[PDB]
């Protein structure tokens, strides 16, 4: 879109041109002639009695090209006193010629939905991590990868909240006025870029920790004999370290060629592929593993009703392995426009916001081992 910084820079250039024009242009000073005035919007030259001084639609407008033809009208009195609209305190300043020639509700609704989802996910997941860490019986290698998934979800929620706060502050009236007159606000500080890099790193780590769980489940079902310690170290390095290899290059390439403002816009669809293609890879891989695990479950159920158990297995595998995104994800941002955009955005935001809560419920609050641990602790507390 048209950035505010470009508009204010062009306004400064126009103001400099008008300031030099008021000095270069000599006033005719004829009978009942006006003088040059600057209403901070158009450079008005000297006028004549009853002469409708017409100035073309000034540049620096965000639209500008929308109205190529049109003149700003500002006449003068018969005695040369800059005719005013209904004898008001300012000259008559009709500007309808150079004017303009809806997503807010949808964006606000999406923000409300995903904020509520992230709040619930954060609470349920801190509780779930506390439950999994307090019970020393639940210290398997499986429950170590689950803890890192919860940590990734928590980091994603924190980054999302911080990004929302940063957006709201950086697009407030005070910061807007500071950028208007002479100041470099939040938008020109490095904290903005650091926050919007942390957001992408947390998102990528969330996408690559569902992949780690799918890979671990596949290796459990497939070839199993392995070194637990080395494989867990490999999974830790592949969950928290692989997203760096395409997030840090994104920060490096968006500091050189496309700085714009706060690294928040994606006007170029080539630098945005650095975080979309790896995420699409991690999404697609988890679909194959999900299909293979469902096939194995079907074979086990058939070898030994089947419909209800298979439905429950699929519905409890959907939250863990992020395979609810397989529907849209390959619907690219370049082709999606209109109602398709809203549908895809709603699905992604709402479902991945509530995915944290669903995973916490299905793998730390309903899991039979956790219930057994709680019951054992309660029974031990019956003797005190």
């Amino acid at each position: 879109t048209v950035s505010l910084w470009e508009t204010v820079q062009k306004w400064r250039e126009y103001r400099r041109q008008c300031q030099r024009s008021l000095t270069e242009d000599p006033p005719p000073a004829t009978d009942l002639f006006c003088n040059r005035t600057f209403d901070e919007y158009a450079c008005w030259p000297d006028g004549e009695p009853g002469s409708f001084v017409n100035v073309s639609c000034p540049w620096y407008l965000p639209w500008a090209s929308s109205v190529p033809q049109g003149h700003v009208y500002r006449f003068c009195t018969a005695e040369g006193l800059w005719l005013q609209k209904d004898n008001s305190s300012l000259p008559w300043r009709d500007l309808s010629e150079c004017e303009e020639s809806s997503p807010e509700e949808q964006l606000l609704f999406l923000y409300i939905i995903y904020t509520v989802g992230y709040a619930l996910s954060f609470s349920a997941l801190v509780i779930a991590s506390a439950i999994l860490l307090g019970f020393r019986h639940l210290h398997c290698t499986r429950n170590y990868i689950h803890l890192n998934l919860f940590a990734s979800f928590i980091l994603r929620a924190l980054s999302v909240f911080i990004k929302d706060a940063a957006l709201k502050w950086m697009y407030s009236t005070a910061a807007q006025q500071h950028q208007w007159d002479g100041l470099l606000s939040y938008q020109d500080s490095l904290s903005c870029r650091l926050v919007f890099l942390l957001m992408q790193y947390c998102v990528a780590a969330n996408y690559y920790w569902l992949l780690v769980e799918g890979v671990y489940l596949y290796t459990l079902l497939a070839f199993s004999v392995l070194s637990e310690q080395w494989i867990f170290r490999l999974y830790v390095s592949i969950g928290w370290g692989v997203p760096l290899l395409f997030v840090v290059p994104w920060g490096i390439v968006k500091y050189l060629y496309e700085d714009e403002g706060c690294w928040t816009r994606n006007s170029n669809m080539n630098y945005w592929l650095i975080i979309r293609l790896p995420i699409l890879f991690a999404i697609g891989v988890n679909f194959l593993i999900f299909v293979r695990v469902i096939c194995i479950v079907v074979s086990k159920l058939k070898a030994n009703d089947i419909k209800c158990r298979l439905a429950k297995s699929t519905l409890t595998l959907i939250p863990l392995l992020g395979t609810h995104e397989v529907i849209f994800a390959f619907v690219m941002d370049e082709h999606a426009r209109g109602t398709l955009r809203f549908i895809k955005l709603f699905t992604e935001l709402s479902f991945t916001s509530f995915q944290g809560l669903m995973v916490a419920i299905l793998y730390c609050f309903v899991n039979n081992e956790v219930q057994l641990e709680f019951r054992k602790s309660w029974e031990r507390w019956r003797l005190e």
């Binding site: 879109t1 048209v2 950035s3 505010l4 508009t7 204010v8 306004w11 209403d39 901070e40 919007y41 407008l61 965000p62 300012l90 500007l95 303009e100 997503p103 807010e104 964006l107 999406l110 923000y111 995903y114 994603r156 999302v160 990004k163 957006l167 697009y171 807007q176 208007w180 919007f196 957001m199 992408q200 998102v203 403002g261 706060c262 928040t264 816009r265 994606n266 945005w272 975080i275 979309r276 941002d333 955005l345 992604e348 935001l349």
Partner: peptide, 28 residues
């Protein structure tokens, strides 16, 4: 959470230019 932010920011900054123009029109 990257496609949504590029939509909120693109619209929020789009109205920022209009607000700037209105401020320059209201009298500054």
């Amino acid at each position: 959470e990257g496609t949504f932010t590029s939509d909120v920011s693109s619209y929020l900054e789009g109205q920022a230019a209009k607000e700037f123009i209105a401020w320059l029109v209201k009298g500054r």
